[PDB]
């Protein structure tokens, strides 16, 4: 049986690569986290609240320009708030009505909507008058578009509710370079701040990091038995923090190939949906199902600050890629921004 | 610009706020539910209740069905007819019911259901969709309810099977009761008239019964 | 959700293509990590709370 003997080969290579992994597990940060100072207290109280919405926010994305906020709600709507004018401009209904994940573009020319509808919409922006038009909608990827990306204003990569990972292109609207190695049911992924890299999500936790060109030789990140919901990078192109639903954030590192510290320090019995690093690479803001969110040191593995503005879960949150605000999107129609 | 376009921002959001207000009010008034994104909308008595299926995705769904907050129904009922190759769909349906009945956010969801009546020959067809001692023992022992109607052309088991399913369903709902909460049985009597009619009746009772879960002291 | 027979084939092909990946010392990788973090530790006002002096959304 070629299937059986080949799978047995698969466990043999798995054992070998785990032996290499353990050998690479030479040491641990112990001294560094023991002697380096604890991060200190955090307040980051209520600063900007997006009380405008009326449904359950399902996703969100700050724009690398730190200008306008996409929120792929569940009304047939996909609002676009603003960073520093405290309000919104293009509240733009949708052809289909229910979408889970958002997306966005660096500049403002595009903005997407790929989620429950099973269609990756891509909106447009000509003028700020009423009835904001729609650009080329994209489809052809079965199962709800679980999360999709715009590296620059021309390239679209998606990994969605099909257990596949595909790169479309806005104009041509066909596969550019897809990726097929995954098995979970993706629910979020994020992009390196240098735009050269995005890292996948997973249910079987194998949060894959593959390169935009073709997904070159990389690693699938075992462990971490719950789902991942919350992946974002710190500006080093080597590590992230897969947020979690079993309360256990992690800090898998691309360079070292290894996870570093889980965050299973109890008093939390809930889930987490989105986490984006304060670019210092030190704080790591992941929100908890209760009406609060609790800080996590990236290098001390000790919680240090509370973030409580919601009532129900927090569905997606984020930090400004400039370093000026942290934003949170709940299920209870409440989208909060903390300083 | 912004040194003068402050009025531009206020007018933009105010205009789209009025538009959004009205459109999502049209949404928020109406009510909705899963089914056997096909908004095959019906309309009765001052509301066009917003019926819609979801089928088409893959099967494993813990996060999609996670989305349904304020989506107030279950309808799926199956019979393992010719169309083995078919067996034990109820405990699939009943399991799914347990799920929606102990999930963190599907727990506050006043569910309903609609059975099938093509079961005129339960034990007399194929013995697989039949309720026998080899499928449910509860069926073999079970009694008759506090109100019966064994319609002709059926064995007594094939008659009271509807009430037996009713009582198993009430078992997993309220006899285990894990949530001190309510579920609604029904069946198909007149297509598109009695079906949707009882739909509105017991779904106004659904919104009623949400009003009683949510501000119980009427 | 892929239970096809060839799903094993694709997984094992990817695994074999992963039989030769880069290997980096964990201690020195983490060393560069916290060196990077401490180098930037003066930037994010979230990290050390720098007041509304530079923050736009200091409203009422």
């Amino acid at each position: 049986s070629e299937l059986d003997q080949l799978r047995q080969e698969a466990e043999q290579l798995k054992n070998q690569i785990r032996d290499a992994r353990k050998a690479c597990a030479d040491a641990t940060l112990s001294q560094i986290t023991n002697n380096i100072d604890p991060v200190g207290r955090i307040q980051m109280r209520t600063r900007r609240t997006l009380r405008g919405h009326l449904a359950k926010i399902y996703a969100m994305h700050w724009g690398t320009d730190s200008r306008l906020l996409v929120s792929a709600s569940q009304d047939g709507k996909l609002i676009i708030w603003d960073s520093y004018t405290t309000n919104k401009v293009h509240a733009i209904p949708l052809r289909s009505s229910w979408v889970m994940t958002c997306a966005y573009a660096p500049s403002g020319n595009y903005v997407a909507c790929g989620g429950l509808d099973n269609i990756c919409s891509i909106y447009n922006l000509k003028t700020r008058e009423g009835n904001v038009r729609v650009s080329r909608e994209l489809a052809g990827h079965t199962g709800y578009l679980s999360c999709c990306r715009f590296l620059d204003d021309n390239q679209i990569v998606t990994s969605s509710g099909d257990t596949t990972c595909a790169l479309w292109d806005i104009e041509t609207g066909q596969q550019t370079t897809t990726f097929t190695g995954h098995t979970g049911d993706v629910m979020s992924l994020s992009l390196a701040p240098d735009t050269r890299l995005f890292v996948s999500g997973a249910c079987d936790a194998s949060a894959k990091l593959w390169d935009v060109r073709e997904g070159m030789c990389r690693q699938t990140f075992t462990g971490h038995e719950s789902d991942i919901n919350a992946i974002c990078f710190f500006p080093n192109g080597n590590a992230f923090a897969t947020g979690s639903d079993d309360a256990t954030c992690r800090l898998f590192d691309l360079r070292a190939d290894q996870e570093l510290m889980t965050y299973s320090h109890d008093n939390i019995i809930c889930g987490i949906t989105s986490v984006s690093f304060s670019k210092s690479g030190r704080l790591l803001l992941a929100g908890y199902d209760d009406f609060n969110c609790n800080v996590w040191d990236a290098l001390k593995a000790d919680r240090a600050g509370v973030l409580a503005g919601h009532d129900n879960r927090v569905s997606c949150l984020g930090v400004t890629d400039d370093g000026m605000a942290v934003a949170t999107g709940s299920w209870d129609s409440f989208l909060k921004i903390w300083n | 610009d912004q040194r003068n376009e402050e009025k531009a921002q206020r007018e933009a959001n105010k205009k789209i706020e009025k538009q959004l207000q009205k459109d999502k009010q049209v949404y928020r008034a109406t009510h909705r539910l899963l089914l056997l994104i096909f908004e095959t909308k019906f309309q009765v008595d001052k509301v066009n209740f917003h019926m819609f299926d979801v089928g088409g995705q893959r099967d494993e769904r813990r996060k999609w069905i996670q989305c349904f907050n304020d989506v107030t129904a279950i309808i799926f009922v199956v019979a393992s007819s010719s169309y083995d190759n078919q067996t034990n769909r109820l405990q699939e349906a009943l399991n799914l019911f347990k799920s929606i009945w102990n999930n963190r956010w599907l727990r506050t969801i006043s569910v309903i259901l609609f059975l099938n009546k093509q079961d005129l020959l339960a034990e007399k067809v194929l013995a697989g969709k039949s309720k026998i001692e080899d499928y449910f023992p509860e069926f073999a022992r079970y009694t008759t309810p506090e109100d019966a109607t064994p319609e002709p052309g059926e064995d007594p088991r094939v008659t009271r099977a509807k009430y037996f399913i009713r009582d198993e369903f009430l078992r997993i709902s309220t006899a285990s009761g894990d949530g001190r909460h309510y579920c609604y049985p029904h069946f198909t009597c007149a297509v598109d008239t009695e079906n949707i009619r009882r739909v509105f009746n017991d779904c106004r009772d659904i919104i009623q019964r949400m009003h009683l879960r949510q501000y119980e002291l009427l | 959700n892929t239970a096809s027979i060839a799903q094993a084939r694709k997984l094992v092909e990817q695994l074999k293509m992963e039989a030769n990946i880069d290997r980096i010392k964990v201690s020195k990788a983490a060393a560069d990590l916290m060196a990077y973090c401490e180098a930037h530790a003066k930037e994010d006002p979230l990290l050390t709370p720098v007041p509304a002096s530079e923050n736009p959304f200091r409203e009422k």
Partner: nanobody, 128 residues
Framework: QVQLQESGGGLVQPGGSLRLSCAAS????????MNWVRQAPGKGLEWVSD????????SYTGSVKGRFTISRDNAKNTLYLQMNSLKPEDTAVYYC?????????????????????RGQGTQVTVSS
């Protein structure tokens, strides 16, 4: 990492003189539910049993109602359950499935195509 490798099965008679068990790996097993699911010839995703947050309802399907018992134990870190005397000569491959999202007493997903957290299978059929 989730080395949900089965243990037990392969071949057994209607006597069912064999025991099935599981393999868990590195998590708060004391907060997951569990359940076991078998596979009818091709379309088999029935819900054979479960075992709630230890010290709660332990239910079973109509085909095996009341008869099965499902074994949980922290120390051995191996989820057991006993089989015998009622269709144990089934050709249905079992699966030591695992209810996701610990710290709440519910689970979903008996999906018909390979499932994330469940084991790769557990043979059982008739010996000679």
């Amino acid at each position: 990492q989730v080395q949900l490798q089965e243990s037990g099965g392969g071949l057994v008679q209607p006597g069912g003189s064999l025991r099935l068990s599981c393999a868990a790996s590195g998590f708060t097993f004391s907060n997951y539910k569990m359940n076991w699911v078998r596979q009818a010839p091709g379309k088999g995703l029935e819900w054979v049993s479960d075992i709630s947050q230890s010290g709660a309802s332990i239910s079973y399907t109509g085909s095996v109602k009341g008869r099965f018992t499902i074994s949980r134990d922290n120390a051995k870190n191996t989820l057991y359950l006993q089989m015998n005397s009622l269709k144990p000569e089934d050709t249905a491959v079992y699966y030591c499935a695992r209810c996701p999202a610990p710290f709440t007493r519910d689970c979903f997903d008996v999906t018909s195509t390979t499932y994330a957290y469940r084991g790769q299978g557990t043979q059982v059929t008739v010996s000679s």
